[PDB]
């Protein structure tokens, strides 16, 4: 690799800068917190009546599991137009408030 970095075949006497050494990872750990419970997403999407525009409904959601599998199955494909995040990464990133 000294011959590779000088682009030659007969390197001269001296000191060179070949590359750098990185300690590689050994294993992997995934430790999001110990919480488990089915989410109230079924009320907000399968509600019979929604509120009007001028007085729109309020919902607080907490202590769930963020399952985003039934979203594509309740209705056919339509727009998402998702700004902060891509729509397909929602499960991995985890959610705050």
């Amino acid at each position: 690799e000294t011959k590779c970095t000088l682009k030659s075949f007969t390197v001269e006497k001296g000191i060179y800068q070949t590359s750098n050494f990185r300690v590689q990872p050994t294993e992997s750990i995934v430790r999001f917190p110990n919480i488990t419970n089915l989410c109230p997403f079924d009320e907000v999407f399968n509600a019979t009546r929604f509120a009007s525009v001028y007085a729109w409904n309020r919902k607080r959601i907490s202590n769930c599991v963020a399952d985003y599998s039934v979203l594509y199955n309740l209705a056919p494909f339509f727009t998402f137009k998702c700004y902060g995040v891509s729509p397909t990464k929602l499960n991995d990133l985890c959610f705050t408030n």
Binding site: G84, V85, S86, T88, K89, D92, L93
Partner: protein, 49 residues
């Protein structure tokens, strides 16, 4: 890379790579001028000793 999908991530990460490149060219460019002032004084110390 965790939030957005791969296609537009490039647009966003291209700004940071090009931003940090010109943020690091300015380091090298200013180092080459400071070393041209030290060498103007190292050659003045060598002709003073």
């Amino acid at each position: 890379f965790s939030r957005l999908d791969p296609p537009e991530a490039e647009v966003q990460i291209d700004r940071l790579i090009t931003g940090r490149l010109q943020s690091l060219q300015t380091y090298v460019t200013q180092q080459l001028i400071r070393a041209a002032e030290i060498r103007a004084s190292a050659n003045l110390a060598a002709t003073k000793m």
